[PDB]
Amino acid sequence: NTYINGMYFAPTQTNKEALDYIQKYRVEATLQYSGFKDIGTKDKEMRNYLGDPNQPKTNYVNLRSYFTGGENIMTYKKLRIYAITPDDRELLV
Amino acid sequence: LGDPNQPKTNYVNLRSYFTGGENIMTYKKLRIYAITPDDRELLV
Amino acid sequence: YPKKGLSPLALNTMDQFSSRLIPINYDQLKKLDAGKQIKLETTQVSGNF
């Protein structure tokens, strides 16, 4: 098994300002026991892309710091947006 | 060349660009930005 | 102040005799890091005539 820790999300391209515009992501994923529970919202984090010390800073979703007890697996999940007034969807699998 | 007794020269930090992978020994171009215009320096 | 063609004014200190730059702890730094922005208000102005 491989469990996911987080999502080094949307690497620095040559044309992106929209990653400076969001403040909150909203997760739905399947835990190991009682799968597909709803989890809450948090704020984004800024980290170096892929941990390289000479590489810009992108968004990040620290999936361990949510309202879980267990892990995540390679199954159904959704990743939604809090734009400043409305909701939006960004990632699915 | 990393010598601690050697003058300071230019450097092009190729890891800190918009890549995800590596570079290889094939076709490449490396260009100046002079203060108004564009100009070319290195080709392989 | 300043005039129309000059750069703005910079404030970074908080003493009467200017040392001790303004601090921010860890939670306020992580809130500032996540894209938020602080607001600046004025309260009073004392002057001369």
Short mmCIF file of all heavy atoms in Angstrom, two decimals, chain B:
data_model
loop_
_atom_site.label_atom_id
_atom_site.label_comp_id
_atom_site.label_asym_id
_atom_site.label_seq_id
_atom_site.Cartn_x
_atom_site.Cartn_y
_atom_site.Cartn_z
N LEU B 1 34.56 27.90 -10.29
CA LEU B 1 34.87 26.49 -10.01
C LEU B 1 34.85 26.15 -8.53
O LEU B 1 35.45 25.15 -8.13
CB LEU B 1 36.21 26.07 -10.61
CG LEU B 1 36.39 26.28 -12.10
CD1 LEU B 1 37.77 25.84 -12.52
CD2 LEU B 1 35.34 25.50 -12.85
N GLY B 2 34.18 26.94 -7.70
CA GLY B 2 34.10 26.65 -6.29
C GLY B 2 35.36 26.88 -5.49
O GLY B 2 35.39 26.54 -4.30
N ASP B 3 36.41 27.44 -6.09
CA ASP B 3 37.62 27.75 -5.34
C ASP B 3 37.34 28.90 -4.38
O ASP B 3 36.74 29.91 -4.77
CB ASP B 3 38.75 28.14 -6.28
CG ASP B 3 39.60 26.96 -6.68
OD1 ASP B 3 39.72 26.01 -5.88
OD2 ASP B 3 40.16 26.98 -7.79
N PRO B 4 37.75 28.80 -3.11
CA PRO B 4 37.56 29.93 -2.19
C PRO B 4 38.57 31.05 -2.38
O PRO B 4 38.45 32.07 -1.70
CB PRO B 4 37.71 29.28 -0.81
CG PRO B 4 38.60 28.12 -1.06
CD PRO B 4 38.25 27.60 -2.43
N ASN B 5 39.55 30.90 -3.26
CA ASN B 5 40.45 31.99 -3.64
C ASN B 5 40.47 32.07 -5.17
O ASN B 5 41.36 31.54 -5.83
CB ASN B 5 41.85 31.79 -3.05
CG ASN B 5 42.31 30.36 -3.13
OD1 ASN B 5 41.60 29.49 -3.64
ND2 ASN B 5 43.51 30.10 -2.64
N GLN B 6 39.49 32.78 -5.71
CA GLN B 6 39.19 32.91 -7.13
C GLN B 6 38.13 33.99 -7.22
O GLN B 6 37.27 34.07 -6.34
CB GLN B 6 38.71 31.58 -7.71
CG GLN B 6 38.79 31.45 -9.22
CD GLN B 6 40.21 31.41 -9.74
OE1 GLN B 6 40.65 32.31 -10.46
NE2 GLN B 6 40.94 30.36 -9.40
N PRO B 7 38.15 34.85 -8.24
CA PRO B 7 37.19 35.96 -8.28
C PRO B 7 35.78 35.48 -8.58
O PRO B 7 35.55 34.35 -9.02
CB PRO B 7 37.73 36.84 -9.41
CG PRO B 7 39.16 36.50 -9.50
CD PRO B 7 39.24 35.05 -9.20
N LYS B 8 34.82 36.36 -8.32
CA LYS B 8 33.41 36.06 -8.50
C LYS B 8 33.02 36.32 -9.95
O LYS B 8 33.25 37.41 -10.48
CB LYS B 8 32.56 36.92 -7.57
CG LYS B 8 32.58 36.49 -6.13
CD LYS B 8 31.32 36.95 -5.43
CE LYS B 8 31.03 36.13 -4.19
NZ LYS B 8 31.95 36.46 -3.08
N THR B 9 32.42 35.32 -10.59
CA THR B 9 31.99 35.42 -11.98
C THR B 9 30.47 35.24 -12.05
O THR B 9 29.79 35.12 -11.04
CB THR B 9 32.67 34.37 -12.85
OG1 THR B 9 32.02 33.11 -12.65
CG2 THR B 9 34.13 34.23 -12.51
N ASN B 10 29.96 35.21 -13.28
CA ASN B 10 28.54 34.98 -13.49
C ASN B 10 28.20 33.51 -13.24
O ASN B 10 29.08 32.66 -13.07
CB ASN B 10 28.14 35.37 -14.91
CG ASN B 10 28.01 36.86 -15.08
OD1 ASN B 10 28.86 37.62 -14.63
ND2 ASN B 10 26.95 37.29 -15.73
N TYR B 11 26.90 33.21 -13.25
CA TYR B 11 26.41 31.85 -13.09
C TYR B 11 24.97 31.82 -13.56
O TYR B 11 24.23 32.77 -13.36
CB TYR B 11 26.49 31.39 -11.63
CG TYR B 11 26.29 29.90 -11.43
CD1 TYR B 11 27.36 29.04 -11.42
CD2 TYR B 11 25.02 29.38 -11.22
CE1 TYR B 11 27.18 27.69 -11.23
CE2 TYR B 11 24.83 28.04 -11.03
CZ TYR B 11 25.91 27.19 -11.04
OH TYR B 11 25.72 25.85 -10.85
N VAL B 12 24.59 30.71 -14.20
CA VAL B 12 23.21 30.51 -14.63
C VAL B 12 22.64 29.31 -13.91
O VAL B 12 22.88 28.16 -14.30
CB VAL B 12 23.12 30.33 -16.15
CG1 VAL B 12 21.67 30.35 -16.59
CG2 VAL B 12 23.90 31.40 -16.88
N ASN B 13 21.87 29.55 -12.85
CA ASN B 13 21.37 28.46 -12.01
C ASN B 13 20.24 27.71 -12.69
O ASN B 13 19.07 28.01 -12.44
CB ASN B 13 20.90 29.00 -10.67
CG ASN B 13 20.74 27.92 -9.63
OD1 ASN B 13 21.23 26.81 -9.81
ND2 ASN B 13 20.07 28.23 -8.54
N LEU B 14 20.58 26.72 -13.51
CA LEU B 14 19.62 26.07 -14.39
C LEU B 14 18.60 25.21 -13.66
O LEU B 14 17.58 24.85 -14.26
CB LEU B 14 20.34 25.21 -15.42
CG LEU B 14 20.62 25.88 -16.76
CD1 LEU B 14 21.40 24.97 -17.67
CD2 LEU B 14 19.31 26.27 -17.39
N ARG B 15 18.83 24.86 -12.39
CA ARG B 15 17.82 24.12 -11.65
C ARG B 15 16.64 25.00 -11.27
O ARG B 15 15.52 24.51 -11.15
CB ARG B 15 18.43 23.51 -10.39
CG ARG B 15 19.53 22.52 -10.66
CD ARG B 15 19.03 21.41 -11.55
NE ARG B 15 18.15 20.50 -10.84
CZ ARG B 15 17.41 19.57 -11.43
NH1 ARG B 15 17.44 19.43 -12.75
NH2 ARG B 15 16.63 18.78 -10.71
N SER B 16 16.87 26.30 -11.08
CA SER B 16 15.82 27.22 -10.65
C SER B 16 15.11 27.86 -11.82
O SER B 16 14.94 29.08 -11.89
CB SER B 16 16.42 28.27 -9.73
OG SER B 16 17.55 28.87 -10.33
N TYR B 17 14.66 27.05 -12.76
CA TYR B 17 13.90 27.50 -13.91
C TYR B 17 12.61 26.69 -13.96
O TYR B 17 12.28 25.96 -13.03
CB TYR B 17 14.71 27.37 -15.19
CG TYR B 17 15.64 28.53 -15.46
CD1 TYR B 17 16.80 28.69 -14.72
CD2 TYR B 17 15.38 29.44 -16.46
CE1 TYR B 17 17.65 29.74 -14.96
CE2 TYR B 17 16.23 30.49 -16.71
CZ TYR B 17 17.37 30.63 -15.95
OH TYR B 17 18.23 31.67 -16.19
N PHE B 18 11.87 26.82 -15.06
CA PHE B 18 10.55 26.20 -15.16
C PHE B 18 10.66 24.83 -15.82
O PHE B 18 10.18 24.59 -16.93
CB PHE B 18 9.61 27.12 -15.92
CG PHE B 18 9.41 28.44 -15.24
CD1 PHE B 18 10.06 29.57 -15.69
CD2 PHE B 18 8.59 28.54 -14.14
CE1 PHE B 18 9.88 30.78 -15.06
CE2 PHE B 18 8.41 29.74 -13.50
CZ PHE B 18 9.05 30.86 -13.96
N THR B 19 11.30 23.92 -15.10
CA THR B 19 11.45 22.53 -15.50
C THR B 19 10.77 21.63 -14.48
O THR B 19 10.26 22.08 -13.45
CB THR B 19 12.93 22.14 -15.62
OG1 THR B 19 13.50 22.01 -14.31
CG2 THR B 19 13.71 23.20 -16.38
N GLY B 20 10.74 20.34 -14.78
CA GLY B 20 10.42 19.34 -13.78
C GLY B 20 11.50 18.28 -13.73
O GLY B 20 11.69 17.63 -12.70
N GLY B 21 12.22 18.12 -14.83
CA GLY B 21 13.20 17.06 -14.98
C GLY B 21 14.63 17.53 -15.12
O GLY B 21 15.07 18.40 -14.36
N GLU B 22 15.37 16.97 -16.07
CA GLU B 22 16.80 17.20 -16.22
C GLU B 22 17.11 17.89 -17.55
O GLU B 22 16.22 18.31 -18.29
CB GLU B 22 17.55 15.88 -16.11
CG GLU B 22 17.84 15.46 -14.70
CD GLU B 22 16.66 14.80 -14.04
OE1 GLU B 22 15.70 14.45 -14.75
OE2 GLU B 22 16.68 14.63 -12.80
N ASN B 23 18.40 18.02 -17.85
CA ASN B 23 18.89 18.48 -19.14
C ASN B 23 19.89 17.46 -19.64
O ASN B 23 20.48 16.73 -18.85
CB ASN B 23 19.55 19.85 -19.04
CG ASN B 23 18.63 20.92 -18.51
OD1 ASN B 23 18.12 21.75 -19.26
ND2 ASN B 23 18.44 20.94 -17.20
N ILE B 24 20.10 17.41 -20.96
CA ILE B 24 21.01 16.43 -21.53
C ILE B 24 21.94 17.11 -22.54
O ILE B 24 21.86 18.31 -22.78
CB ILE B 24 20.26 15.25 -22.19
CG1 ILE B 24 19.21 15.75 -23.17
CG2 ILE B 24 19.65 14.33 -21.14
CD1 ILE B 24 18.55 14.63 -23.95
N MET B 25 22.85 16.30 -23.11
CA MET B 25 23.89 16.78 -24.02
C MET B 25 23.36 16.79 -25.46
O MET B 25 23.73 15.96 -26.30
CB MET B 25 25.13 15.91 -23.90
CG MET B 25 26.40 16.54 -24.44
SD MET B 25 26.96 15.80 -25.98
CE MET B 25 27.88 14.40 -25.37
N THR B 26 22.48 17.74 -25.74
CA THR B 26 21.80 17.85 -27.03
C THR B 26 21.63 19.35 -27.29
O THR B 26 22.36 20.17 -26.71
CB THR B 26 20.48 17.04 -27.02
OG1 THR B 26 20.64 15.83 -26.27
CG2 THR B 26 20.10 16.56 -28.42
N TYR B 27 20.70 19.71 -28.18
CA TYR B 27 20.51 21.07 -28.68
C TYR B 27 20.12 22.04 -27.57
O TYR B 27 19.23 21.75 -26.77
CB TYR B 27 19.43 21.03 -29.76
CG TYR B 27 19.20 22.29 -30.57
CD1 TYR B 27 20.19 23.25 -30.73
CD2 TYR B 27 17.99 22.48 -31.22
CE1 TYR B 27 19.96 24.39 -31.49
CE2 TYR B 27 17.75 23.61 -31.98
CZ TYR B 27 18.74 24.56 -32.11
OH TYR B 27 18.50 25.68 -32.87
N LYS B 28 20.78 23.20 -27.52
CA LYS B 28 20.47 24.23 -26.53
C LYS B 28 20.93 25.59 -27.03
O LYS B 28 21.83 25.71 -27.87
CB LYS B 28 21.10 23.91 -25.17
CG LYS B 28 22.48 24.50 -24.94
CD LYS B 28 22.97 24.17 -23.56
CE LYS B 28 22.10 24.83 -22.53
NZ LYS B 28 22.45 26.27 -22.37
N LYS B 29 20.27 26.63 -26.51
CA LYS B 29 20.60 28.02 -26.78
C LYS B 29 20.54 28.80 -25.47
O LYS B 29 19.69 28.54 -24.62
CB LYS B 29 19.65 28.68 -27.78
CG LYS B 29 19.48 27.95 -29.10
CD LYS B 29 20.69 28.12 -29.99
CE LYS B 29 20.31 28.00 -31.45
NZ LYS B 29 21.34 27.26 -32.23
N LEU B 30 21.43 29.79 -25.33
CA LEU B 30 21.54 30.56 -24.10
C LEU B 30 21.81 32.01 -24.48
O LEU B 30 22.85 32.31 -25.07
CB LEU B 30 22.65 30.01 -23.22
CG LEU B 30 22.78 30.54 -21.80
CD1 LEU B 30 21.42 30.72 -21.18
CD2 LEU B 30 23.59 29.55 -20.99
N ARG B 31 20.89 32.91 -24.10
CA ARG B 31 20.78 34.25 -24.64
C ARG B 31 20.90 35.31 -23.56
O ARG B 31 20.41 35.14 -22.44
CB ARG B 31 19.43 34.42 -25.34
CG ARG B 31 19.48 34.35 -26.83
CD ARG B 31 18.09 34.40 -27.39
NE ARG B 31 17.44 33.11 -27.30
CZ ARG B 31 17.58 32.15 -28.20
NH1 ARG B 31 18.33 32.34 -29.27
NH2 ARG B 31 16.95 31.00 -28.04
N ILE B 32 21.52 36.43 -23.91
CA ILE B 32 21.60 37.59 -23.04
C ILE B 32 20.27 38.32 -23.08
O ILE B 32 19.56 38.28 -24.09
CB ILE B 32 22.74 38.53 -23.50
CG1 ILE B 32 24.03 37.79 -23.78
CG2 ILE B 32 23.06 39.56 -22.49
CD1 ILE B 32 24.30 37.67 -25.22
N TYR B 33 19.92 39.00 -21.99
CA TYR B 33 19.10 40.20 -22.07
C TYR B 33 19.98 41.40 -21.78
O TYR B 33 20.28 41.70 -20.62
CB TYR B 33 17.93 40.16 -21.10
CG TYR B 33 16.74 39.41 -21.61
CD1 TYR B 33 15.68 39.10 -20.77
CD2 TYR B 33 16.65 39.05 -22.95
CE1 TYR B 33 14.57 38.43 -21.25
CE2 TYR B 33 15.54 38.37 -23.43
CZ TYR B 33 14.50 38.07 -22.57
OH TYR B 33 13.40 37.40 -23.04
N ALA B 34 20.38 42.11 -22.83
CA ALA B 34 20.98 43.42 -22.66
C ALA B 34 19.88 44.39 -22.26
O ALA B 34 18.69 44.06 -22.31
CB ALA B 34 21.73 43.84 -23.92
N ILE B 35 20.25 45.62 -21.90
CA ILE B 35 19.39 46.45 -21.05
C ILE B 35 18.13 46.91 -21.79
O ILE B 35 17.02 46.83 -21.25
CB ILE B 35 20.21 47.61 -20.42
CG1 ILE B 35 19.39 48.34 -19.36
CG2 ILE B 35 20.84 48.55 -21.45
CD1 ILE B 35 19.27 47.57 -18.07
N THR B 36 18.25 47.40 -23.03
CA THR B 36 17.08 47.34 -23.91
C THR B 36 16.94 46.08 -24.79
O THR B 36 15.88 45.44 -24.71
CB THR B 36 16.96 48.65 -24.73
OG1 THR B 36 16.08 48.46 -25.85
CG2 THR B 36 18.30 49.31 -25.12
N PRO B 37 17.94 45.66 -25.65
CA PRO B 37 17.63 44.62 -26.64
C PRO B 37 17.93 43.20 -26.20
O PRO B 37 18.30 42.95 -25.06
CB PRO B 37 18.52 45.03 -27.82
CG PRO B 37 19.76 45.52 -27.15
CD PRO B 37 19.38 45.98 -25.74
N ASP B 38 17.76 42.26 -27.13
CA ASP B 38 18.06 40.84 -26.95
C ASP B 38 19.35 40.49 -27.70
O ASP B 38 19.70 41.15 -28.68
CB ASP B 38 16.90 39.99 -27.46
CG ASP B 38 17.04 38.52 -27.13
OD1 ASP B 38 17.46 38.21 -26.01
OD2 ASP B 38 16.73 37.68 -28.00
N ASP B 39 20.05 39.45 -27.24
CA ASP B 39 21.32 39.05 -27.82
C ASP B 39 21.63 37.61 -27.44
O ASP B 39 21.14 37.12 -26.43
CB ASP B 39 22.44 39.98 -27.36
CG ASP B 39 23.54 40.12 -28.37
OD1 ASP B 39 23.91 39.11 -28.99
OD2 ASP B 39 24.04 41.25 -28.55
N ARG B 40 22.47 36.94 -28.24
CA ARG B 40 22.78 35.52 -28.06
C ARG B 40 24.25 35.29 -27.73
O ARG B 40 25.13 35.98 -28.25
CB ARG B 40 22.41 34.73 -29.32
CG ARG B 40 22.21 33.25 -29.08
CD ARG B 40 23.39 32.43 -29.57
NE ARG B 40 23.46 32.41 -31.02
CZ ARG B 40 24.60 32.39 -31.71
NH1 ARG B 40 25.76 32.40 -31.08
NH2 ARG B 40 24.57 32.37 -33.04
N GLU B 41 24.51 34.30 -26.85
CA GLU B 41 25.85 33.97 -26.36
C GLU B 41 26.29 32.53 -26.62
O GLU B 41 27.42 32.32 -27.06
CB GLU B 41 25.97 34.21 -24.86
CG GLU B 41 26.91 35.31 -24.44
CD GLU B 41 26.67 35.71 -23.00
OE1 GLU B 41 25.74 35.15 -22.39
OE2 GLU B 41 27.37 36.60 -22.48
N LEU B 42 25.44 31.55 -26.34
CA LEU B 42 25.93 30.17 -26.30
C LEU B 42 25.01 29.26 -27.08
O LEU B 42 23.78 29.36 -26.98
CB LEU B 42 26.05 29.68 -24.85
CG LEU B 42 26.46 28.22 -24.63
CD1 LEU B 42 27.84 27.99 -25.18
CD2 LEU B 42 26.40 27.85 -23.18
N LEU B 43 25.60 28.36 -27.87
CA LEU B 43 24.85 27.39 -28.65
C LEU B 43 25.63 26.08 -28.70
O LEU B 43 26.86 26.07 -28.75
CB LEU B 43 24.54 27.91 -30.06
CG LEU B 43 25.59 27.96 -31.18
CD1 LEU B 43 24.91 28.26 -32.50
CD2 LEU B 43 26.71 28.97 -30.94
N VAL B 44 24.89 24.97 -28.68
CA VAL B 44 25.46 23.64 -28.83
C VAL B 44 24.64 22.85 -29.85
O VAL B 44 24.31 23.35 -30.92
CB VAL B 44 25.52 22.88 -27.49
CG1 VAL B 44 25.82 21.42 -27.73
CG2 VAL B 44 26.59 23.46 -26.60
#
